[PDB]
Amino acid sequence: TTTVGITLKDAVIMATERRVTMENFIMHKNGKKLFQIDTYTGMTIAGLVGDAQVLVRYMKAELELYRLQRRVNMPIEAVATLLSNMLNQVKYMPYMVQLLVGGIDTAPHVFSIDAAGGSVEDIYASTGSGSPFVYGVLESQYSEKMTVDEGVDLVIRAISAAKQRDSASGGMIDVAVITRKDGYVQLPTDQIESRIRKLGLI
């Protein structure tokens, strides 16, 4: 698995691959690992599929409830804190997952979360077996001064590399973009294929 989430001036960008592996072979190619849990919030997952799908259902509920009762969206620091407690409470019968949380409130934010409840904010992060091949690309090409079009091409250059070196990563790339203006937006597949040919990765 390979997930990635970065942070820019007024935007957030998250991306994954789609390959899934059950029974020690490639059983599914078009899985799903990137979800919209709020109007200006998204999440990725890596690890045990069942334990992850469950959470995504819990979170979608807790956040849609809040939004209806209080009439506004929960911040991002609180979302991560809510999870941190929901996982630490069962750290001895735990969920075996790694998560990323990204969204917009007054500013962009990205959080990494472990199975025991540890939450840390960062400008960019990655999870999965292909994470290190991504950190190597970001350490060398990331720049806070970049635009959105440049950041999209980056996450693609990064995951396309993990697919070339991690056997448990593969498939078409799913990308999302978040802004206070247009909100959560999942990019069409054709725009991805276009940028790929434009970059030379096929």
The residue range among 99-107, 116-124, 154-162, 176-184 that interacts with a second copy, by the rule CB under 8 A, is: 116-124
Site membership for a second copy, residue 110 (CB under 8 A): no
Let me know: does 1 contact 46? Beta carbons within 8 Å. yes
Site membership for other proteins, residue 61 (CB under 8 A): yes
For residues 28 and 198, which CB has a smaller minimum distance to a second copy in the complex? 28
> Can 1 be counted among the known catalytic residues?
yes
Site membership for other proteins, residue 30 (CB under 8 A): no
The DSSP annotation for 103-165 comes to: EESSSEEEEEE-TT--EEE-SEEEESTTHHHHHHHHHHH--TT--HHHHHHHHHHHHHHHHTT
Site membership for other proteins, residue 120 (CB under 8 A): no
Least CB distance from residue 58 to other proteins, whole Å? 7
For residues 134 and 156, which CB has a smaller minimum distance to a second copy in the complex? 134
Residues 112-124: b if buried by 16+ CB within 10 A, e if exposed: bbbbebebeeeeb
Torsion of CA 117, 123, 35, 182, to 10 degrees: 140
Could you give the string, one character per residue 157-176, with x where binding to a second copy holds by CB under 8 A and - elsewhere? --------------------
46 vs 77: CA distance, rounded Å:
21
Binding residues vs other proteins (CB under 8 A): 57-58, 60-61, 64-65, 68-72, 74-75, 77-78, 81-82, 85
